[PDB]
């Protein structure tokens, strides 16, 4: 259509960081006394490593009541990266109030430091009315807008007279679930029949595959007793194994998490954790944490521990956390180790 | 997300010095009184002291009292420290004592402070409340900050992340491991192993012969001649891995195999690969191949190409060969040209 298909797209690598300057009022390192920061990367590969360079009274004798803020790029692969940086003035509630942004995009190379002379006023920082030093602690927010800005597309704008169906590996196999043909044997669980065959589970489930050849299929292929789960969970297990997807996730995650942990289905376990991660709440933390511990869903243990760290003020007095305390010592011990050693 | 932390360790401690009979403490003329050392805060690491000159060591100190602080011991030559002193608020006095407006480096065996504080008679004046029981009580605050270590924090935590999909992963592993060798197919000498359900699902034509209750005998002596073993290996690779990297130079045989097995997607991708294969010299060959394989899309593309390049396509002898061999193609082409070109004589 219209011959060309000009669709030049701008790639924006946006990512933010917040600062925590401890009792900056009497830190008092002036006139070139170097101060650095913790280096950070965008996360998508480790290419940019930055470090802060700030003089409370900016270098040279002209910025007496003013700060010289500078971002220094320690090193990056030679690509002539162009990026934009912005900051602001912070308040008690951790929200930017006075925000100043770079007028243009600066060309970044290794050893090149970019910044604004006279970034912010010293007395305004020290102005008690502005409230920029809550409990004498100064903080700052930095939002990056690194742009690669390198994409070339030529052609094709094909008319595409015919439509090509995608690969039908899933629906062809999954659609055989309800129809239930070519099933060599039967399968009943919890006294309920879900008719299915074993070879496909062998191909699609290593646990059964190893456990298949070990002296069951010779005799007990017709009937295998599975009682860890319920039929409503086993049907979703079978649908996920066949198709690879389980849209019915949230309402029955934890039981299916146990089902996955039985067979070590890693994708299934992590999608259970996804379903549970968004369900984190003050009254739900304890049961989620013991659930993660019991099935060794390590990540969900980590997020639940961090949620307990950030909501110890109220989760402690919930009945759930008292149940966790009285029932399990080691869980409280681990939460304590993670909240004292790591935070503190 | 940084939580940059950037902790600065600052140690504040105090040492309350009180003297009896302060009126008599001007005893050793302009010289100095040596106090008792002390340590506190960080596990008594540092020893500190201070001394007072009630009468001036030098001429300038004769005017005002000089309480000039001394360092006893320190592990490092550089010790950035703040010093502030005042009275211990017997009556109301939290003022009248100066402050150190700048942080000075403290080094082993060295002393630092100031000397111009208050007149001696004014100090001894009880009207200022500076002789409680002929005693002077001091409120010194020493704040020593160690240059920052302790930067970092990171805060690199975005959701929970997901490992890659295992749908295609399990296909490749079972093929390479050569496990569950449930059948052996001998075709063109070469031996090929595979499973039943996957072959039945992907190829309905394979399932059709095996759906008639005779599979145990058919698998052992499966008759496969129409498709060469290399194309069979390519078909297995496409089914399991999901890719056909070498499809460009073997599209035609793979296309015929897809036609035989009714693999619609395989036929479509073979046609797409062959779509970017037309040239001025073999256009007739691609056209007749598409017509033989009932490739409607490729046939229409070849017809459009011929309509575009008739100024040169008809020059080649392939057109005459097609005319002589298959006249009905010429008949329908003439019908299409006449029907399309309604105007003109």
XYZ file of C-alpha atoms in Angstrom:
689
model
C 0.000 0.000 0.000
C 1.315 3.423 -1.057
C 4.533 1.744 -2.239
C 6.826 2.551 0.692
C 6.007 1.742 4.327
C 7.987 4.425 6.168
C 7.685 3.407 9.829
C 10.905 4.639 11.431
C 10.486 3.899 15.137
C 12.351 5.488 18.057
C 13.604 3.080 20.736
C 13.431 4.570 24.246
C 15.229 2.722 27.059
C 13.546 4.384 30.044
C 14.527 3.462 33.603
C 14.633 5.304 36.917
C 16.630 5.420 40.145
C 16.269 7.144 43.519
C 19.018 8.464 45.788
C 19.576 8.300 49.539
C 22.172 10.762 50.857
C 22.693 10.122 54.563
C 22.782 13.319 56.684
C 24.073 15.467 53.835
C 23.937 18.600 56.023
C 27.259 17.896 57.788
C 28.871 15.441 55.366
C 30.977 18.436 54.297
C 33.297 17.280 51.507
C 33.991 20.386 49.421
C 36.187 21.702 46.598
C 37.057 18.672 44.521
C 36.933 16.040 47.259
C 35.650 13.209 45.103
C 32.345 11.481 45.893
C 31.104 8.476 43.878
C 27.932 6.376 43.826
C 26.843 2.778 43.280
C 27.039 1.976 39.575
C 23.891 0.775 37.813
C 22.857 -0.634 34.435
C 19.634 -0.514 32.444
C 19.208 -4.268 33.027
C 18.984 -5.197 29.343
C 22.608 -6.362 29.129
C 25.497 -4.784 31.081
C 26.854 -2.040 28.804
C 26.496 1.305 30.640
C 28.126 1.822 34.043
C 27.625 5.284 35.528
C 28.812 7.032 38.678
C 27.743 10.307 40.259
C 30.056 13.318 40.596
C 28.596 16.066 42.807
C 30.262 18.946 44.651
C 27.978 20.526 47.327
C 29.625 23.849 46.471
C 30.262 23.386 42.760
C 33.827 23.479 41.429
C 35.309 26.895 40.606
C 34.613 29.888 42.863
C 31.478 31.104 41.048
C 28.916 28.546 42.312
C 29.024 29.555 45.964
C 25.298 28.980 46.650
C 24.880 26.470 43.826
C 25.544 22.826 42.950
C 27.348 21.411 39.908
C 25.584 18.132 39.085
C 27.407 15.822 36.664
C 26.763 12.308 35.377
C 29.986 10.479 34.479
C 29.999 7.428 32.201
C 32.734 5.105 33.459
C 32.888 2.936 30.335
C 30.706 1.487 27.586
C 31.292 -0.275 24.255
C 32.010 2.161 21.444
C 28.607 2.984 19.948
C 28.253 6.776 20.474
C 25.203 6.414 22.700
C 22.818 9.383 22.832
C 20.747 9.670 26.003
C 18.694 12.083 28.104
C 18.725 12.422 31.896
C 16.451 14.297 34.291
C 16.198 14.866 38.034
C 13.977 16.765 40.460
C 13.618 18.072 44.011
C 12.074 15.593 46.440
C 9.607 16.035 49.306
C 8.643 14.172 52.474
C 6.299 11.732 50.701
C 8.945 10.653 48.165
C 7.387 12.465 45.190
C 9.115 14.827 42.778
C 7.866 18.407 43.206
C 10.286 20.626 41.231
C 11.440 18.693 38.154
C 14.062 19.898 35.666
C 14.798 17.987 32.456
C 17.635 18.081 29.948
C 16.883 20.474 27.098
C 18.359 18.098 24.485
C 19.869 14.629 24.122
C 23.567 14.448 24.973
C 26.086 12.340 23.071
C 27.735 9.934 25.527
C 31.150 8.323 25.048
C 33.572 6.623 27.416
C 35.277 9.114 29.712
C 32.727 11.833 28.856
C 30.743 13.356 31.735
C 27.588 15.404 31.132
C 25.950 17.776 33.585
C 24.492 21.201 34.254
C 26.448 23.949 35.963
C 24.354 25.653 38.666
C 21.968 22.714 38.901
C 20.237 23.680 42.166
C 20.549 26.337 44.860
C 22.261 25.576 48.165
C 20.130 27.850 50.345
C 16.951 26.542 48.704
C 18.076 23.076 49.776
C 18.778 24.584 53.208
C 15.528 26.588 53.148
C 13.536 25.188 56.057
C 10.227 26.253 54.490
C 10.779 24.018 51.445
C 11.128 20.875 53.571
C 13.722 19.231 51.315
C 15.621 17.659 54.268
C 13.105 15.386 56.021
C 14.800 14.149 59.203
C 18.051 15.675 57.836
C 18.124 13.019 55.065
C 18.332 14.256 51.468
C 17.095 12.166 48.541
C 17.057 12.655 44.776
C 15.373 10.936 41.829
C 17.010 10.187 38.473
C 15.081 9.060 35.382
C 17.084 7.911 32.353
C 15.866 8.005 28.742
C 18.671 6.212 26.889
C 17.880 6.056 23.162
C 19.654 3.743 20.730
C 18.188 5.461 17.645
C 19.460 3.005 15.017
C 16.935 1.109 12.886
C 16.755 0.720 9.094
C 13.896 -0.989 7.237
C 13.679 -1.237 3.438
C 10.634 -2.821 1.834
C 8.580 -4.875 1.326
C 4.872 -4.021 1.681
C 3.849 -7.417 0.322
C 0.169 -7.650 -0.585
C -0.097 -11.141 0.997
C -2.815 -12.587 -1.229
C -3.138 -15.708 0.970
C -3.233 -16.146 4.747
C -0.750 -18.572 6.325
C -2.007 -20.403 9.449
C 0.532 -20.559 12.257
C 1.931 -23.826 13.587
C -0.941 -26.057 14.731
C 1.035 -28.278 17.116
C -0.997 -27.152 20.134
C -4.625 -26.989 18.999
C -4.396 -30.247 17.031
C -3.159 -32.030 20.153
C -5.282 -29.957 22.531
C -8.426 -30.343 20.449
C -8.019 -34.099 20.877
C -8.625 -33.577 24.611
C -12.399 -33.155 24.392
C -12.717 -35.470 21.389
C -10.525 -38.085 23.155
C -9.500 -40.230 20.163
C -6.334 -42.275 19.615
C -6.088 -42.767 23.397
C -4.230 -46.031 23.995
C -5.303 -46.337 27.656
C -7.546 -44.691 30.255
C -6.697 -42.474 33.224
C -8.773 -42.048 36.397
C -7.762 -39.736 39.258
C -9.564 -39.264 42.592
C -12.291 -41.626 41.383
C -12.980 -39.496 38.276
C -12.143 -40.500 34.702
C -10.131 -38.165 32.470
C -9.499 -40.312 29.394
C -5.970 -39.711 28.085
C -2.881 -41.545 26.815
C 0.576 -41.970 28.302
C 3.016 -41.545 25.398
C 2.220 -37.854 24.973
C 2.752 -37.240 28.693
C 6.050 -39.110 28.419
C 7.139 -36.818 25.595
C 5.780 -33.722 27.368
C 6.561 -34.615 31.024
C 9.992 -35.976 32.071
C 8.759 -37.154 35.488
C 6.179 -39.562 34.085
C 8.576 -40.554 31.282
C 11.269 -41.692 33.701
C 8.558 -43.110 35.966
C 6.752 -44.774 33.020
C 9.372 -47.329 32.009
C 10.096 -48.309 35.645
C 7.792 -51.290 36.048
C 4.282 -49.741 35.940
C 3.288 -49.700 32.258
C 3.863 -53.459 31.985
C 0.942 -54.110 34.373
C -0.628 -50.891 35.703
C -0.887 -48.914 32.450
C -4.681 -49.264 32.460
C -5.019 -47.683 35.929
C -2.655 -45.268 37.674
C -3.899 -43.759 40.939
C -3.293 -40.015 41.354
C -4.655 -38.470 44.562
C -2.423 -35.444 45.235
C -4.739 -33.241 43.144
C -8.482 -32.938 42.514
C -10.248 -33.385 39.142
C -10.660 -29.636 38.610
C -6.868 -29.294 38.901
C -5.926 -32.442 36.982
C -8.008 -31.362 33.984
C -6.135 -28.050 33.866
C -2.848 -29.937 34.261
C -3.700 -32.116 31.272
C -4.832 -29.136 29.185
C -1.617 -27.273 30.006
C 0.569 -30.283 29.192
C -1.177 -30.777 25.847
C -1.595 -27.150 24.745
C 1.171 -25.515 26.786
C -1.226 -22.875 28.173
C -3.637 -22.720 31.124
C -5.878 -19.632 30.871
C -7.770 -20.854 33.968
C -4.992 -19.855 36.374
C -5.921 -17.396 39.114
C -8.938 -19.066 40.717
C -7.051 -22.355 41.355
C -3.353 -21.459 41.462
C -2.145 -22.892 44.781
C -3.563 -26.400 44.368
C -2.157 -26.427 40.850
C 1.117 -25.091 42.271
C 1.245 -28.229 44.408
C 0.440 -30.258 41.291
C 3.300 -28.622 39.381
C 5.726 -29.040 42.278
C 4.916 -32.753 42.258
C 6.082 -33.044 38.618
C 8.620 -30.158 38.620
C 6.938 -28.348 35.710
C 9.033 -25.188 35.870
C 6.881 -22.994 33.620
C 3.767 -24.141 35.451
C 5.327 -23.354 38.835
C 6.425 -19.874 37.785
C 3.009 -18.994 36.343
C 1.504 -20.084 39.661
C 3.969 -17.731 41.345
C 2.930 -14.947 38.953
C -0.696 -15.549 39.914
C 0.263 -15.437 43.602
C 2.694 -12.502 43.345
C -0.071 -10.064 42.391
C -2.176 -11.508 45.243
C 0.325 -10.404 47.911
C -1.411 -8.548 50.730
C -0.915 -7.843 54.418
C -3.244 -10.599 55.646
C -2.175 -13.072 52.917
C 1.611 -12.946 53.370
C 2.021 -15.749 55.913
C 0.046 -18.440 54.087
C 1.745 -17.488 50.816
C 5.183 -17.740 52.427
C 4.596 -21.135 54.035
C 3.061 -22.294 50.741
C 6.192 -21.239 48.862
C 8.443 -22.911 51.430
C 6.553 -26.207 51.325
C 6.872 -26.500 47.524
C 10.335 -24.839 47.366
C 9.028 -22.138 45.007
C 12.105 -20.099 45.811
C 11.219 -16.886 43.996
C 7.783 -16.555 45.608
C 9.541 -17.090 48.924
C 11.741 -14.124 48.015
C 8.889 -11.775 47.065
C 6.828 -12.840 50.094
C 9.819 -12.205 52.362
C 10.304 -8.758 50.821
C 6.600 -7.974 51.238
C 6.869 -8.956 54.903
C 9.932 -6.708 55.146
C 7.972 -3.767 53.719
C 4.787 -4.443 55.758
C 6.098 -5.699 59.116
C 4.134 -2.850 60.724
C 0.770 -4.627 60.293
C 1.323 -8.186 59.025
C 2.787 -9.170 62.409
C -0.478 -8.794 64.342
C -2.519 -10.674 61.728
C -3.712 -14.112 62.812
C -1.944 -15.640 59.815
C 1.500 -14.514 60.912
C 0.881 -15.745 64.458
C -0.069 -19.116 62.980
C 3.172 -19.053 60.986
C 5.137 -18.154 64.129
C 3.686 -20.845 66.383
C 3.612 -23.533 63.683
C 6.989 -22.888 61.999
C 10.179 -21.555 63.671
C 12.459 -21.576 60.655
C 10.193 -19.378 58.527
C 10.261 -16.587 61.106
C 13.992 -17.193 61.459
C 14.504 -16.748 57.711
C 12.339 -13.625 57.600
C 14.408 -12.286 60.502
C 17.695 -13.084 58.770
C 16.496 -11.392 55.581
C 15.167 -8.341 57.453
C 18.186 -7.814 59.747
C 21.228 -8.855 57.706
C 20.101 -7.654 54.274
C 18.179 -4.483 55.164
C 20.017 -3.571 58.266
C 15.181 1.389 41.682
C 18.555 1.928 43.402
C 18.185 2.320 47.179
C 21.599 3.937 46.864
C 21.982 3.856 50.658
C 25.318 5.788 50.648
C 25.736 5.450 54.386
C 28.097 7.890 56.098
C 29.198 6.743 59.550
C 29.292 9.592 62.080
C 30.193 9.024 65.740
C 29.062 11.642 68.266
C 30.270 11.489 71.866
C 30.708 13.803 74.840
C 32.955 14.145 77.901
C 31.729 16.207 80.835
C 34.586 18.018 82.594
C 33.876 19.707 85.935
C 36.431 21.462 88.144
C 36.308 22.357 91.839
C 37.311 25.823 93.063
C 37.558 27.424 89.627
C 38.669 30.721 91.180
C 41.900 28.951 92.207
C 42.395 27.210 88.841
C 44.496 30.146 87.532
C 47.271 28.704 89.663
C 50.003 27.764 87.154
C 50.136 31.229 85.525
C 49.797 31.350 81.708
C 50.482 27.612 81.406
C 47.902 24.876 80.890
C 45.902 22.355 82.931
C 45.941 18.750 81.683
C 42.619 16.906 81.918
C 41.901 13.166 81.889
C 41.642 11.294 78.604
C 38.527 9.370 77.613
C 37.021 7.017 75.056
C 33.460 6.064 74.130
C 31.213 5.337 71.169
C 32.901 2.937 68.760
C 34.232 0.300 71.228
C 36.629 2.846 72.791
C 38.710 2.805 69.610
C 39.908 6.418 69.928
C 41.334 8.260 72.937
C 40.494 11.947 73.300
C 41.218 14.765 75.726
C 41.003 18.524 76.163
C 42.856 21.169 78.164
C 42.105 24.682 79.399
C 44.199 27.852 79.688
C 42.683 30.038 82.451
C 45.537 32.493 81.838
C 47.063 32.972 78.412
C 49.812 30.722 77.113
C 50.615 33.588 74.717
C 49.829 37.301 74.809
C 46.627 36.990 72.770
C 45.201 34.274 75.032
C 45.673 36.601 78.028
C 42.433 38.388 77.104
C 39.966 35.484 76.803
C 39.983 31.922 78.090
C 41.419 29.371 75.648
C 39.980 25.837 75.848
C 42.133 24.305 73.129
C 41.371 20.644 72.464
C 44.034 17.945 72.031
C 44.017 14.509 70.394
C 45.518 11.609 72.362
C 45.530 8.625 69.992
C 44.207 7.879 66.515
C 45.000 5.046 64.050
C 44.808 7.248 60.931
C 46.546 10.549 60.249
C 43.340 12.008 58.778
C 40.478 12.371 61.263
C 37.691 14.680 60.100
C 36.015 15.841 63.313
C 33.673 18.548 64.591
C 34.097 20.084 68.050
C 31.532 22.115 69.992
C 31.514 23.107 73.666
C 29.249 24.914 76.129
C 28.085 24.927 79.767
C 25.998 22.166 81.386
C 22.839 24.294 81.821
C 22.830 24.602 85.618
C 20.882 27.818 85.232
C 19.532 28.600 81.768
C 22.548 28.617 79.438
C 22.413 26.731 76.146
C 23.989 29.781 74.416
C 27.064 32.029 74.978
C 29.444 29.260 73.732
C 30.777 29.418 70.182
C 30.655 26.706 67.506
C 33.228 25.281 65.102
C 32.100 26.562 61.699
C 34.495 24.294 59.761
C 35.805 20.741 60.063
C 39.566 20.500 60.569
C 41.772 17.450 60.113
C 42.930 15.820 63.359
C 46.274 13.997 63.341
C 48.232 12.002 65.912
C 49.870 14.122 68.600
C 48.271 17.370 67.364
C 45.799 19.744 69.013
C 43.098 21.966 67.549
C 40.420 24.364 68.739
C 40.040 28.076 69.388
C 41.161 30.585 72.021
C 38.960 33.740 71.890
C 35.845 32.848 73.914
C 35.162 35.082 76.942
C 36.898 37.525 79.284
C 38.386 36.165 82.501
C 36.706 38.682 84.810
C 33.473 38.250 82.849
C 33.866 34.486 83.265
C 34.380 34.929 87.010
C 31.426 37.342 87.098
C 28.595 35.561 88.899
C 26.082 37.802 87.092
C 26.641 35.637 83.999
C 25.957 32.473 86.012
C 29.429 31.078 85.281
C 30.568 30.230 88.839
C 28.198 27.552 90.172
C 29.748 26.675 93.551
C 33.056 28.043 92.213
C 32.944 25.303 89.561
C 32.933 25.317 85.759
C 30.934 22.589 84.021
C 31.552 21.861 80.341
C 29.378 20.323 77.610
C 31.691 19.201 74.799
C 30.293 17.402 71.744
C 32.822 15.701 69.451
C 31.407 14.461 66.132
C 33.872 12.416 64.053
C 32.781 11.273 60.586
C 34.691 8.516 58.812
C 35.020 9.228 55.038
C 32.303 7.211 53.294
C 32.568 3.538 52.624
C 29.153 1.805 52.486
C 27.863 2.964 49.051
C 25.302 0.684 47.171
C 22.020 -0.920 47.438
C 21.273 -1.891 43.748
C 17.444 -2.492 44.140
C 17.504 -4.658 40.943
C 14.204 -6.514 41.307
C 11.540 -6.513 38.569
C 8.624 -8.915 39.097
C 9.598 -12.639 39.220
C 10.665 -13.454 35.616
C 9.757 -16.584 33.624
C 12.036 -19.265 32.097
C 11.612 -19.996 28.414
C 8.732 -22.061 27.043
C 9.261 -25.829 27.214
C 6.941 -26.842 24.352
C 9.694 -27.088 21.731
C 12.378 -27.999 24.284
C 10.870 -31.397 25.090
C 10.609 -32.322 21.401
C 14.336 -31.937 20.784
C 15.448 -33.799 23.898
C 13.449 -36.963 23.260
C 14.680 -37.076 19.658
C 18.366 -36.718 20.549
C 18.284 -39.053 23.564
C 16.916 -41.856 21.328
C 14.612 -42.935 24.169
C 11.210 -44.603 23.785
C 12.344 -46.387 20.621
C 8.809 -47.610 19.964
C 9.268 -48.232 16.222
C 11.965 -48.748 13.594
C 11.417 -47.597 10.003
C 13.747 -48.827 7.243
C 13.526 -46.521 4.211
C 16.152 -46.328 1.444
C 18.549 -48.270 3.664
C 18.661 -45.573 6.335
C 16.937 -46.183 9.677
C 14.604 -43.556 11.160
C 13.087 -43.689 14.653
C 10.017 -41.780 15.830
C 6.848 -42.017 17.942
C 3.233 -42.759 17.074
C 1.025 -39.966 18.432
C 3.134 -37.078 17.104
C 3.346 -38.615 13.626
C -0.402 -39.264 13.588
C -1.135 -35.702 14.710
C 1.166 -33.840 12.318
C 0.531 -36.012 9.227
C -3.132 -37.031 8.710
C -2.071 -39.136 5.712
C 0.246 -41.189 7.927
C -2.575 -41.633 10.444
C -5.020 -42.703 7.718
C -3.101 -45.868 6.838
C -2.496 -46.599 10.534
C -6.171 -46.006 11.430
C -7.244 -49.305 9.792
C -6.090 -51.468 12.759
C -2.880 -52.579 10.932
C 0.089 -50.659 12.370
C 2.430 -53.212 13.967
C 3.172 -54.802 10.584
C 3.107 -51.521 8.648
C 5.677 -49.790 10.870
C 8.261 -52.561 10.481
C 7.923 -52.628 6.665
C 6.615 -49.119 5.984
C 6.640 -48.408 2.245
C 8.130 -44.951 1.632
C 9.550 -44.402 -1.871
C 7.805 -41.286 -3.202
C 9.849 -39.087 -0.815
C 13.615 -39.437 -0.496
C 15.195 -40.123 2.927
C 16.767 -36.647 3.017
C 13.349 -35.011 2.680
C 12.033 -37.345 5.387
C 14.833 -36.199 7.701
C 13.982 -32.588 6.851
C 10.319 -33.268 7.662
C 11.268 -34.775 11.031
C 13.481 -31.758 11.738
C 10.648 -29.374 10.846
C 8.190 -31.289 13.034
C 10.472 -31.460 16.078
C 12.734 -28.393 15.995
C 10.204 -26.221 14.145
C 12.579 -24.862 11.471
C 13.685 -25.750 7.934
C 16.937 -23.784 7.483
C 17.910 -25.517 4.209
C 14.397 -25.300 2.720
C 15.466 -22.916 -0.063
C 17.427 -25.492 -2.091
C 14.925 -28.334 -1.446
C 11.546 -26.577 -1.607
C 10.227 -28.537 -4.600
C 10.730 -32.046 -3.196
C 9.560 -30.900 0.240
C 6.566 -29.236 -1.432
C 5.692 -32.510 -3.169
C 6.062 -34.355 0.143
C 3.698 -31.859 1.782
C 1.228 -32.390 -1.065
C 1.405 -36.159 -0.558
C 0.970 -35.841 3.226
C -1.511 -32.917 2.979
C 0.744 -30.731 5.150
C -0.954 -27.434 4.339
C 1.430 -25.257 6.356
C 4.489 -26.993 4.891
C 3.111 -26.500 1.377
C 2.443 -22.833 2.143
C 5.951 -22.122 3.439
C 7.430 -24.027 0.492
C 5.415 -21.816 -1.864
C 6.559 -18.721 0.043
C 10.190 -19.807 -0.307
C 9.583 -20.479 -4.007
C 7.875 -17.083 -4.362
C 11.286 -15.427 -3.891
C 12.855 -17.763 -6.459
C 11.437 -16.606 -9.821
C 13.824 -15.555 -12.595
C 13.452 -14.528 -16.226
C 14.877 -17.824 -17.547
C 13.009 -20.452 -15.463
C 9.628 -18.709 -15.154
C 7.946 -21.366 -17.304
C 9.525 -24.123 -15.201
C 8.186 -22.603 -11.976
C 4.779 -22.110 -13.612
C 4.462 -25.726 -14.766
C 5.767 -26.986 -11.414
C 3.158 -24.886 -9.592
C 0.406 -26.126 -11.913
C 1.468 -29.747 -11.388
C 1.416 -29.305 -7.593
C -1.871 -27.314 -7.662
C -0.177 -24.282 -6.077
C -2.900 -21.704 -6.681
C -0.935 -18.868 -5.062
C 2.278 -19.677 -6.933
C 0.307 -20.234 -10.148
C -1.337 -16.811 -9.836
C 2.014 -15.181 -9.050
C 3.552 -16.815 -12.129
C 0.616 -15.652 -14.266
C 1.053 -12.089 -12.988
C 4.799 -12.297 -13.654
C 4.125 -13.465 -17.217
C 1.604 -10.662 -17.751
C 4.250 -8.214 -16.510
C 7.198 -9.618 -18.514
C 5.531 -10.888 -21.714
C 7.923 -8.621 -23.651
C 10.701 -11.137 -22.822
C 9.058 -14.270 -21.351
C 7.730 -15.431 -24.728
C 11.212 -15.104 -26.273
C 12.479 -18.204 -24.456
C 11.854 -21.640 -25.957
C 10.093 -22.750 -22.763
C 6.973 -20.915 -23.913
C 6.999 -22.785 -27.232
C 7.590 -26.082 -25.420
C 4.579 -25.378 -23.196
C 2.513 -24.397 -26.250
C 3.315 -27.629 -28.086
C 3.056 -29.941 -25.073
C 0.053 -28.473 -23.207
C -2.173 -26.506 -25.625
C -4.985 -26.069 -23.080
C -2.715 -23.709 -21.137
C -2.476 -21.568 -24.278
C -6.251 -21.785 -24.738
C -7.060 -20.614 -21.209
C -4.344 -17.938 -21.371
C -5.869 -16.584 -24.588
C -9.316 -16.668 -22.974
C -8.024 -14.734 -19.955
C -6.270 -12.178 -22.171
C -9.376 -11.667 -24.317
C -11.700 -11.506 -21.303
C -9.385 -9.118 -19.446
C -8.905 -6.886 -22.514
C -12.532 -6.103 -23.281
C -11.669 -2.915 -25.272
C -9.448 -2.773 -28.396
C -10.295 -4.255 -31.801
